[PDB]
Design a binder for this molecule. Structure first.
Ligand SMILES: CCN(CC)CCNC(=O)c1c(C)[nH]c(/C=C2\C(=O)Nc3ccc(Cl)cc32)c1C
Length: 289
């Protein structure tokens, strides 16, 4: 019956207030478009969700709630939501540099870039975890950059909320290659699931693809809780291999917090400013052009 659902959104037709432009990517329940707020003229990202198609409605509601409860320069900003029949327009912050996955397209990343990106992801994780929120879908595709090199976490479509009522989660959610073993087994889990997913993302930043990409997603789901954790192989520095090993511990009790990882040798070795990442944005622009 969706009682109280429409009350939370502006019933004003979003085509009058916003000018919809080109598609820039996709989200958990819809397509992401570039837009301009007709009043301020300011650039925005618009996510259009078909409620009849994604009828997943509890999760759409979860993403709305999560985004409106976050207030951090490390989390994509939310500007409201507009309903137009079965379509829901979610207006968010515009990040012109695209994703960390988009940025791997022209070629491999030097270690200096990887350490800077991981440091900024950790600042985002530290904020979420302090707010008792778990992202649950940490991967390069969900790490976005502004045209100035600011790194932000996006896509709260499967995000979890811990309380004094619910100390742990048990929901089976995420993308197979990046999923923590306790998530797959549906054991009671917390913020430590994002730490494991960050370790998979660290390998993905170094290799362009997560570990065991040569395997079928369903085979990987069956093997993650049974096999030894992945390792960073090949020509990479010892502190980088150590950072990955710290994240990829099968026992969550031994995985460090985001705050601890911000003190890791791999993260502290390089002291690049986020503006350093604009070179990757320029490289991607030259490659696409
Ligand atoms: C088809 C995608 N294409 C690569 C071939 C373009 C690369 N991506 C972008 O240009 C891009 C841009 C400029 N902005 C975004 C995504 C945004 C974005 O800008 N804000 C935002 C908020 C929430 C979510 Cl889930 C996603 C986004 C994206 C994916």
């Amino acid at each position: 019956h969706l009682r109280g659902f429409a009350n939370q959104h502006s019933r004003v037709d979003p085509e009058e207030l916003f000018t919809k432009l080109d598609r820039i990517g996709k989200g958990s329940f819809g397509e992401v478009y570039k837009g301009i707020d007709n009043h301020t003229k300011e650039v925005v990202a618009i996510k259009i969700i078909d409620l009849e198609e994604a009828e997943e409605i509890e999760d759409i509601q979860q993403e709305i709630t999560v985004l409106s409860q976050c207030d951090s320069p490390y989390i994509t900003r939310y500007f409201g939501s507009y309903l137009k029949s079965t379509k829901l327009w979610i207006i968010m912050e515009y990040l012109g540099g695209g994703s960390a996955l988009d940025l791997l397209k022209p070629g491999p990343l030097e270690e200096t870039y990887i350490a800077t990106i991981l440091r900024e992801i950790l600042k985002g994780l530290d904020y979420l975890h302090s707010e008792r929120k778990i992202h649950r879908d940490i991967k390069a595709a969900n790490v976005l950059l502004s045209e100035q090199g600011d790194v932000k976490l996006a896509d709260f479509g499967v995000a979890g909320q811990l309380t004094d009522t619910q100390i742990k989660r048990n929901t089976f959610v995420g993308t197979p290659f990046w999923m923590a073993p306790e998530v797959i087994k549906q054991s009671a889990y917390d913020f430590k699931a994002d730490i494991w997913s960050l370790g998979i993302t660290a390998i993905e930043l170094a290799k362009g693809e997560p570990p065991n990409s040569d395997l079928h997603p369903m085979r990987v789901l069956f093997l993650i809780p049974k096999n030894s954790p992945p390792t960073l192989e090949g020509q990479h520095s010892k502190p980088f291999k150590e950072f990955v090993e710290a994240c990829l511990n099968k026992d969550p009790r031994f995985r460090p917090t985001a705050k601890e990882l911000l003190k890791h040798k791999f993260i502290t070795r390089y002291t690049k400013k986020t503006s350093f990442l604009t070179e990757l944005i320029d490289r991607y622009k030259r490659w696409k052009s």
